Amino acid sequence: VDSVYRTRSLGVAAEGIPDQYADGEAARVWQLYIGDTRSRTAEYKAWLLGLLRQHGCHRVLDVACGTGVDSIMLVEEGFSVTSVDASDKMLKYALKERWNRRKEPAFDKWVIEEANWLTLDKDVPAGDGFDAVICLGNSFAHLPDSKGDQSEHRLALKNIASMVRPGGLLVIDHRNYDYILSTGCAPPGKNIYYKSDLTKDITTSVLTVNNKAHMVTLDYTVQVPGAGRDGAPGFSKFRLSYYPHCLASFTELVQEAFGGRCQHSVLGDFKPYRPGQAYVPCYFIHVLKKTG
Amino acid sequence: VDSVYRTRSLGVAAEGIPDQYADGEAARVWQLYIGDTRSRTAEYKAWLLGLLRQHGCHRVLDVACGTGVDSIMLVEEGFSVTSVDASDKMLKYALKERWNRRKEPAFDKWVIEEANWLTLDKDVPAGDGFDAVICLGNSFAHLPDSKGDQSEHRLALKNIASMVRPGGLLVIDHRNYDYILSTGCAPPGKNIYYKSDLTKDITTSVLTVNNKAHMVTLDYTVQVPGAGRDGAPGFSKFRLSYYPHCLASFTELVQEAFGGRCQHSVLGDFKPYRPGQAYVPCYFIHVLKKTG
Amino acid sequence: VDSVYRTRSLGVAAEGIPDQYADGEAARVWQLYIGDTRSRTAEYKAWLLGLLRQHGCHRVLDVACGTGVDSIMLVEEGFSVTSVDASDKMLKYALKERWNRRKEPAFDKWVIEEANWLTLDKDVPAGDGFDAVICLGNSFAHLPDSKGDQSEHRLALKNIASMVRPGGLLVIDHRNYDYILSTGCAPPGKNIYYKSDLTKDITTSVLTVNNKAHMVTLDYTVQVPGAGRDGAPGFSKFRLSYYPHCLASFTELVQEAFGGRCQHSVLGDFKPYRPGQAYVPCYFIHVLKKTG
Amino acid sequence: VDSVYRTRSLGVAAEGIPDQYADGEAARVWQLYIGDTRSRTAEYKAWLLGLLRQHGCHRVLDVACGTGVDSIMLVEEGFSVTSVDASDKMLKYALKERWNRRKEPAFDKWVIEEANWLTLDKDVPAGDGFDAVICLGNSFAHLPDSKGDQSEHRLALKNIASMVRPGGLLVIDHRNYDYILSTGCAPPGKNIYYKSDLTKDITTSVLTVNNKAHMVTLDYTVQVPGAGRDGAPGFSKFRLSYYPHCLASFTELVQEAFGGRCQHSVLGDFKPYRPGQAYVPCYFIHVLKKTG
Ligand SMILES: C[S@@+](CC[C@H](N)C(=O)[O-])C[C@H]1O[C@@H](n2cnc3c(N)ncnc32)[C@H](O)[C@@H]1O
Ligand SMILES: C[S@@+](CC[C@H](N)C(=O)[O-])C[C@H]1O[C@@H](n2cnc3c(N)ncnc32)[C@H](O)[C@@H]1O
Ligand SMILES: C[S@@+](CC[C@H](N)C(=O)[O-])C[C@H]1O[C@@H](n2cnc3c(N)ncnc32)[C@H](O)[C@@H]1O
Ligand SMILES: C[S@@+](CC[C@H](N)C(=O)[O-])C[C@H]1O[C@@H](n2cnc3c(N)ncnc32)[C@H](O)[C@@H]1O
C-alpha cells in the first residue's frame, strides 16, 4: 500500500455480520440434513473418544456447536464440555436439547453460549485453556476471505488455537475441496457427517475470481417429512457458502496458527490418509497437538 | 377441463429489467474505457466499410449503439444509420454527440432510439429491413440465460436477424470466451475495442454452476483523469456480466437465428480465423449474410 | 360448465414475516428499556395478582412473553404459567433466565415456547384452555393492518380469546393512542411498563394515510451503560411500529373477539378509568371475563 | 480527542442521491399526468409572459425543466432559455422534443443540461446571471430535510436565487400544503399544472415525526391509454415525496435566500391571494424580484 492511511472509515456499509444461518431455514431442518445423529456419530465416535482419552482430555470446547450433535455425545461420554457458536438459530436447538435432559447431571453441567471465531479470545475466556477443541462438520470453511488476504482465516484459526491448553488437542476439519474444485461438483449423498435420505439435492457453485477459486456455494434441497398429502411432497431449500480450502494450504494455515509449536496430522474420513490413495475422502480431519 | 394456455412457468427467474448500465457509472466513463475512439475505429474500419460496400449496403441498424462509437463512424462515412440501445444512460451520450454536430447534414438524419433485443421486433419497425445490422463490442454476451434454456438468447438473436433484409448482412461479435473460461482471466489491456491506458484493472469472475460455465463477471477499474491533486489519483469502478458463449455454440446459435438461410463466417480480430492458429483473438466477429 | 382463474388477492408484495425484533437490537437492550423490573412490576403486581386470585386462576398463558418480565413474576407467585412469543430473540432471554433458576421447582415447570397470535390456535394447543391470558406492555399494537381491513387484528384477537377457559380472564392492554394521535408525540419517560433513566429519547412518527391514522412509529434511544470512557457516552437505537388503536375501537374489537360472551372493563394505568378524568393514562388495560 | 467540529457534520446515514425520478416510470407517463400541455399552459401563460415582459426579461433559466413544458413555451415565445434538471429521465423527453423541432431556429438555440439545485452554482455558470428564473410545478418541495435542519432547503434556495441577475425575477411555486396537512388529503383532479382525465387516483400520506409534519407522499395512478383490450384497462403507478412547506415558512425561506434584497409577493393560482379568501388555491406562486 502506498502512502499512509490516516482516514479510513467506511462511507458504504453493505455487508455486516454475515451469519449464513440467520435466516433460520438451515437450522429448522439441520436434523433432517444430518439424518440419524446416532448413525452419524457411530463413525468416528470411537476414534474421537479414543484420541481424547489417549491424551487425557476432560475439558472440551466445541467452537462449531451447531445443534449440539458432537457436543451432546461428548457430554454423554462423561466429558466436561462447553459449546459455542455464532448462530443463535442453531444453538437454539442445542439449548432445547439440554433443557430436555436437564435432569441428567451430565447435561446440567453442559455450557452453551454464543461466540465467534473472529472474537473467540474475548467471547470465551479460555484462561487456563481446554484439553481439547473441536471444529468438525466443515464449519470453518464458512469463513470468507473478503479482506483480500486470508487475514480473517489466520485470526480465527489463531483464536481457536489459543483455546488449546499446552499438550492439548485441536480437531478441525474441512470438506475435500481439492476434489470439489477439480470436478466442480460436491460428492453426492452418503456423507459421514450428513447421511439422510431426506436430502434430495445439493447443487454446487464454484466462483473463481480472476482464475483463483474464491468460493464454493452449495444449494441444498431437503425434503421435510410430509409437507403435503400423498402425491405431493414438500421440500426446504437453503444455501451455504464456503471458502474452498485446498488441503496443503489448510495444513500450512492451521499449523501456523500454533506458531509451529504443535504436532500435525490429517486423516481422510477418520482413516489414515496418504496422497494418491485409492479412497477419496469427503472430509479432511486435521489433528493438532499443541506442545508449547 | 384442465385450463387455458400459458408460456412461462412459476419457477423460472423473470428478473427485473436488468439494465446493467442503469447505475450510469459505466456510461460516465465509457469514453475513458474505450480510449481513443479514432485509434479504436482505425482497426476494422477498413474491413467493416469494405464489407458494407462490397454488399451495397446503405441502410444500417446498430443494435448495440452504446455511446455511438461505430454508429457515428458509419454516419460520417455516408451511411444511413439508425441506432438503438436499451440503456438510456449510454444512448444519452450518442444523442449528446448528434446534437453537437447537428449542423452536419449527415448527423441531422441520424436516428437514435431506445430498444431491446428481446423486443426489437416491436421496438424497431424494420418493415423492409436494413441492408446491414451490427452488434459489435461484446454487447450480446450481456444477455443472461436465466430461463434455464438459451431461450432468451434464441429470441433476441432471432429478432436481431429479423432486421436483416434478404441479401443483407449481420455483424455480431463476442469476446473469445473459449480462452477466458480456459484461463479464468480475461486478456490484459491492448484491446481492439477498448484500448485506453486509463483502465488500470479488469478482474474476472467465472461462475460455473453444476460444472457448467454460467457467467463471467468483469470488474473494471478506470482512472478518471484527475480525481485528485498530484500524489493522489482517483478511479472509477463498475462491473458488467456476460454469458460465456463458446465459439462453436454461438456459431450454431446465430446461424439458427436465420433459419439456416444465410452464409456464415467468423474472423479472429477482423482477420481470418483458423482453429489452432498461433494468434489468439480477443473477440470473434461473426459475419452472416441472409439469403432467403 | 366448468371454470378457471388464478390467485393473488393482494396488490403489493408486502414484507414477509415481519418480526420487528428479528434484528435483535431491541432484545439486547430491553432490560435497559424496562429499567428496574422489580420497580416496574411493583405497580399492578397487587392488582394483577388480586384479580387472578379473585377468579381462582392457576393456569396462566402469556402471549407476549417478551423477556419474561411478567411471566417470571407469575411463576414466582406460584402460578402455572406457559409463555409464548413470536420473537426468538426476546424469548432467548426468558429462556436464559429460566435456566439460571432451573433449580427452583417453580421455574423447572415454567413452559416457554415460540408462537404467533395469527396462528396461536395451532401453536399452543389450549385444549381445555387457560384460567387467564395476559398480553401486557403494548404488544398487540404491533400487529399491522396491511390487509386493508382489521382482519389480522380480528383473527389474532380471536385466537387469543380462544385460549381463555370459560369463566377465565384476558388482560390485554395498549398505549393510549387517543392521546398520541392527538399530540403527535408519545408521553416522555416515567412509564409504568418502562421506567429507565437509560432511555434518553423516544421520537414518535405518525403516519396517517389518506386522513386516517395508519401507524405510529417510535424511535428509541437507550444508553448502554458504558459504551465509552468518561467524556464519551454510547447509545443503542431501535425502532418499533404500532397500529394506533383508539380506545373505543379496541373495546369493540376485543369484545367481539369473545362473541359478546364476556364481561368487559378497562382501567387507566391499572386504576379506574372514567372518560374526561383529569389523569391521562399512558396505557389502557382491558380486562375481559369469558362467560360462555 | 482531536476535533468534534471539523468541516460540517459527519453523517453516517447514506451517500446516494436520491433522484425520485430515477426509476423512470413517472417520466414515461408525465405527459399523461399533465394532460393537455396546451390547456395547462393556457392558464398563467398570459401572466408569466406579461410578468417576464414587464420586467424586460430575455434570458430565462428553468431549474425544474422536467419534460420541457414551460421551457418549450418560453422558447416558442421568443425567449432565450436554458433548462436544467437533475433527472436525466425527465430531461430525456425535453431533449427528444428539441430534436424534433431542431429545424426551428428558436429551438436550435435552446439549451438543455443536467443540474442539481444543491450544486447549481457549479452546474450552471450564471456568470452575469439570468433575467428570470422559474421553478414551477411543485418541484422544489421534492427536496427533503434529512439533515434535521432546513439547511439543504436554504442552500438550494440560495443557489437558485444566485442565478437571478439583479433586477431579475424568480418564480418559484409549491402546492398549498397548509391545506393538505390540514385535511390529510391532496386536492382531487382539476389541477392547473396537471389536468388529465388519465390520472385516476392520487393517494396522500402524511408523515409527521414527533408532532411535526415531515413529509407528504403522493401515490399516483395514471391510466396509460390502452394497456388492455376493451373490458380490461391498464394503469401505471408511481410515488413522489415532498416536504410540506407551509406558506408562511416558504415566504420566509425564499426571501432569506435573497438576503432580503428583493421584492416578494405571492399569488394563489396565479391570481391575487389574500389570506381568508374564499378560493383555496392548489398552488402558491412566489414572485421575487432581486434588487441588490
Ligand atoms: C455446518 S455448521 C455445523 C454443523 C454441526 N457441526 C454438525 O456437525 O452438524 C457450521 C457452523 O459454523 C458456525 N460458524 C460459522 N462462522 C462462525 C464464526 N465466525 N464463529 C463461530 N461459529 C461460526 C455456524 O453458526 C454453523 O452452525
Ligand atoms: C459493451 S456495451 C457497447 C459499447 C459499444 N458497442 C462500444 O463498442 O463501445 C453493450 C451494450 O449492450 C446494450 N444492451 C444490453 N442488453 C441489451 C438488450 N437486451 N437490448 C438492447 N441493447 C442491450 C447496452 O445498453 C450496452 O450499451
Ligand atoms: C413490547 S414487546 C413485550 C415486552 C414485554 N411484554 C414487557 O412487558 O417488557 C411486544 C412483544 O410482542 C411480540 N409479538 C409481536 N407480534 C406477535 C405475534 N404476531 N405473535 C406473538 N407475539 C408477537 C414480540 O415478539 C414482542 O416481544
Ligand atoms: C414535478 S417535477 C416538474 C414537472 C414540470 N415542472 C411540470 O410542470 O410538468 C419536479 C422536477 O424537479 C426536479 N428536481 C428535484 N430535485 C432536484 C434537484 N435537487 N435539482 C434539480 N432538479 C431537481 C426533478 O428532476 C423533477 O423533474
CATH of residue B285's domain is: 3.40.50.150
Atom of ligand 4 nearest to the CA of D193: 8
**Cβ contact C284:C273 at 8 Å:** yes
Strands (E) across chain A are located at: 59-62, 80-85, 111-114, 130-135, 164-175, 199-203, 205-209, 212-223, 235-242, 262-267, 283-290
Q: Which residues line ligand 2 (CB under 6 A)?
A: B 21, 34, 64, 66, 69, 85-87, 90, 116-118, 136-139, 142-143, 193
Is residue C264 part of the annotated active site? The answer reads no
Same domain, A184 and A254: no
Instruction: Please indicate, yes or no, whether residues A67 and A160 belong to a single structural domain of this protein.
Output: yes
Same domain, C60 and C103: yes
Q: Kindly report the CATH number assigned to the domain that includes residue D185.
A: 3.30.46.10
Whether residue A111 sits in one domain with residue A206: no
- DSSP strands (E only) in chain D: 59-62, 80-85, 111-114, 130-135, 164-175, 199-203, 206-209, 212-223, 235-242, 262-267, 283-290
3-state secondary structure of B186: coil
Distance from CA of B52 to the nearest CA of D (A): 29
Residue D222: phi and psi, rounded to 5, are -115, 125
- My answer on whether C180 and C276 are in the same domain is no
| Residue A151 labeled ligand binder | no
Q: Give chain C's domain count.
A: 2
Q: Helical H runs in chain B?
A: 25-28, 30-34, 37-42, 45-54, 69-76, 88-100, 105-108, 120-123, 151-161, 177-183, 247-257
Output the CA–CA distances (angstroms, integers) from residue A96 to A90, B113, C169, D225, in the order listed.
10, 63, 31, 60
Which one, of D146, D126, D216, D203, lies nearest residue D174 by Cα?
A: D216
Residue D185 lies in a domain: yes
With respect to residue A3, please indicate whether it lies within any of the assigned structural domains. Answer: no
Residues A165 and A63 in one domain: yes
Any chains having at least 3 CB pairs less than 8 A from chain A are: B, C
Lookup: cell for B245: 458463449
- CA neighbours closer than 13 Å in the CB half-sphere of residue D80: 7
Q: Among B93, B102, B109, pick the best mutation site for testing chain D contact (most D Cβ within 10 A).
A: B102
Method by which the model was determined:
X-ray
Residue with cell 453460549: A113
Within a domain: D5:
no
Q: Which residues touch B292 (CB under 8 Å, ≥6 apart)?
A: B166, B261
Which H or E element spans position A153?
A: helix A151-161
Q: For Cα atoms D24, D26, D28, give the angle at the middle one, nearest 5 degrees.
A: 70
Question: What CA–CA distances, in Å, run from B44 to A85, A121, B285?
Answer: 60, 62, 10
Same domain, B38 and B87: yes
The dihedrals phi and psi of A109, each to the nearest 5 degrees, come to -95, 20
One domain for residues B166 and B194? no
Mutation test residue for ligand 2: of B82, B139, B216, the one with most atoms within 8 Å of CB? B139
Please give the resolution of this entry in Å, rounded to 1 decimal.
2.8
Dist CA A245 CA B246 (whole Å): 30
Are D114 and D91 a contacting pair, CB within 8 Å?
A: yes
Residues B222, B163 share a domain: no
Range of the domain at D237: 18-33+176-242
Whether the CB of D88 is below 8 Å from some CB of chain B: the reply is yes
d(CA D138, CA C205) in angstroms, rounded, equals 25
Closest by Cα among D26, D231, D261 to D137: D26
Looking at the fold, whether C86 and C157 belong to one and the same domain comes out as yes
Q: Is residue A232 part of a domain?
A: yes
Tracing cell 401486557 back to the chain, one arrives at C136
**Distance, CA of C292 to CA of C164 (rounded, Å):** 10
Strand partners, D204: none
Find the catalytic residue in C21, C44, C93, C242: C21
Co-location of D28 and D166 in the same domain: no
